[PDB]
Design a protein around this ligand. Structure first.
Ligand code: PLP
Ligand code: PLP
Lengths: 329, 329
């Protein structure tokens, strides 16, 4: 698995977008971890060797939470916010992390350094773990694990669609899992609903799904938040939506540009009548949604506030004292 | 992980129950797979070496289905039914298994043979798998995996509680995940709701949870089905419940004993007013529920039909042409 030599790993792109520029560098072919690696049970290992116990409850009962942070031009973006959220999410599940927040950040940054990646996607998961015996059933006997991997930056949406916009679909075959079953404000791997939404998107010929909650209000997408703009007011679902760190940044940007930015309940009518709609997530940043169910949003092209937010997001990735943590390569 | 020598593996018990008797045998200490093993990517390996790629979507997005069958006195129980259900469940998720049903059965039975276990818990999972690169996001590019493990038979409920009964609790902090988010009739590892129910059981001082569905009707428990008996009529939830193979057996037994046995919607009032209530699952068999929320069911002791079903279930584990498949040790 994952047998590609350092020369075969794709870690940069020509984006065609003046505000997204990768670093100009070469991976060291003598470094077996160059271009991607994992931290598992104290070892830094290449992806081909990155394996977890099949008896980990993170697999057997998806008894796990996680976060993904990214690195851009050699700086982790909002790492403190990410690890704070991860630990809050662990606490929500009554998982007691075996490492402190500072220990987690230390290891994660060292992992990225070993990969040499200047632009990276970095997953940190914390599982209920496993017990002294492989068939243990008592949930209270398992000892928790932290697993990390760092791989090239991943794009949920292609560069041309960051420019031109994405054609969204309101999923009707699923609803976002209710908080009364699985809390969507705790980041998790239980994607059964989200994957059905992606499958429906394919079935109906659209590009990305937007799910609704049990009350029929706008929720979120398959690994991303949605933001709706109307008369200069920027809103995003507060209930059935992960509290995204990209979303947080987007609303901060909106306010700095002079717009009211709030979490709120958004109806389907309000989504369709919006001036602008956008999506956001760590794995891809920010992009426009120019139609919903084949109905254009406004004039069917990316709106001015969206474009300002996208540009500003990418500016903050290159120059920001408070938001950037340098990797010590 | 899982460093116990063959002599330290616990693979038999004195049950104190005349109808449950383990085999009388010794594991071969010269066999590294004796007492437990896994089949992963074509290799039979001891539990200490049983590891899956961290990039498997079965972990990263719980994009996986499974079944657990058991072996008793050297015979797999309802193996054909189990693998049929597993493959139906894979199809529901649009996962195309990389092996046929016959190939899966062949490997599973060989795995059990290598462990030497005459009484075993055997998990077979089928994941969306992983792609040529570790950070691939396209769900359609992953190549699916089959993972198996065989370990000593696991008991959800202790022997004394099979005899004396279990004290159940109706969960109110969660509802079973709705079919419109995650289908509970497809066996899955997305246990967020079920685990919250177990946590609530602990919080409120009971022994096992019974969840309700979105309509407030009886659903199922944390890895087990519930069955309610009233005036000689045996009923079990048809909607928010896995179609259990133990349940199937229980209803077959009920009919052979002359009782009407059906899947149905069961109200909370009907649960509390039942003559008898029982639980059932592959990992433990069948047991009585003698109270719900501290209210006795009937006279608070296991009922006659329940006891007849438990005894008959365990009889069918030892003598049954149609239901038993011998392991070739
Ligand atoms: C990760 C995630 C998001 C976005 O969160 P960020 O912190 O911006 O990456 C949105 N929705 C879901 C379901 C997610 O898992
Ligand atoms: C496995 C399972 C059952 C029981 O099914 P069997 O086929 O009898 O083992 C019941 N409920 C849930 C949620 C399960 O995962």
């Amino acid at each position: 698995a994952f047998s590609a030599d350092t020369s075969e790993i794709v870690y940069t792109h020509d984006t065609g977008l003046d505000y997204i520029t990768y670093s100009d560098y070469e991976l060291d072919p003598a470094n077996p971890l160059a271009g991607g690696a994992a931290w598992i049970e104290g070892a830094f290992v290449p992806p081909s060797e990155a394996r977890i116990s099949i008896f980990d409850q993170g697999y057997l009962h998806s008894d796990v939470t996680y976060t993904v942070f990214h690195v851009w031009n050699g700086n982790a973006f909002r790492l403190d916010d990410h690890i704070e959220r991860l630990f809050s999410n662990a606490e929500s599940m009554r998982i007691i992390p075996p490492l402190t927040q500072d220990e987690v950040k230390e290891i994660a940054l060292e992992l990225v350094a070993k990969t040499e990646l200047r632009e990276a996607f970095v997953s940190v998961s914390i599982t209920r773990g496993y017990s002294s015996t492989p068939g243990e059933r008592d949930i209270t006997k398992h000892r928790p694990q932290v697993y990390m991997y760092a791989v090239p930056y991943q794009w949920i949406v292609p560069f041309d669609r960051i420019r031109d916009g994405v054609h969204a679909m309101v999923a009707q075959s699923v609803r976002r899992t209710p908080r009364s079953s699985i809390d969507p404000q705790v980041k998790n791997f239980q994607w059964g609903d989200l994957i059905r939404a992606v499958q429906e998107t394919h079935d109906r010929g659209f590009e990305a799904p937007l799910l609704l909650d049990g009350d029929g209000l706008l929720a979120e997408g398959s690994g991303f938040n949605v933001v709706v703009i109307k008369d200069g007011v920027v809103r995003s679902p507060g209930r059935a939506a992960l509290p995204g760190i990209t979303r947080k940044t987007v609303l901060e940007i909106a306010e700095s540009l002079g717009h009211e930015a709030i979490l709120a309940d958004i109806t389907l009518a309000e989504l369709l009548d919006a001036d602008e709609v956008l999506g956001c997530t760590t794995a891809g940043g920010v992009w426009p949604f120019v139609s919903v169910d084949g109905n254009p949003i406004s004039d069917g092209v990316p709106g001015p506030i969206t474009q300002s937010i996208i540009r500003r997001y990418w500016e903050l990735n290159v120059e920001s004292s408070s938001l950037l943590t340098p990797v010590q390569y």
